[PDB]
Amino acid sequence: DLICAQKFNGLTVLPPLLTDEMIAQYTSALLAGTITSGW
Amino acid sequence: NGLTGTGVLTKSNKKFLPFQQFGRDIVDTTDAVRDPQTLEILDITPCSF
Ligand SMILES: *[C@@H]1O[C@H](CO)[C@@H](O)[C@H](O)[C@H]1NC(C)=O
Numbered sequence: 001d002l003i004c005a006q007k008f009n010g011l012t013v014l015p016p017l018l019t020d021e022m023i024a025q026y027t028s029a030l031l032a033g034t035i036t037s038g039w
Numbered sequence: 040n041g042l043t044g045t046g047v048l049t050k051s052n053k054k055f056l057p058f059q060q061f062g063r064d065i066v067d068t069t070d071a072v073r074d075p076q077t078l079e080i081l082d083i084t085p086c087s088f
Binding site: 001 | 065
């Protein structure tokens, strides 16, 4: 593959600190606080 | 045959054809070889880093 070809030549990708399931829990808090409390 | 490197030789699954000696990936790097004395196709993978 190509993502593996880049890795073997010193080019690697670090993972983000917040997982996509942690960002999706931050969004729910904004949605749940807006509906039940407003601004 | 002078192709020097460091890697993990395995048994390659690539469908080499009688005229094909080496193999190359999408980045033009030697990805397979042919044994000079046994005519077996070996898949080369770099050691972990
Ligand atoms: C000699 O090399 C040939 C290919 O050049 C190979 O087919 C053959 O088996 C070898 N004979 C040996 C290692 O005795």
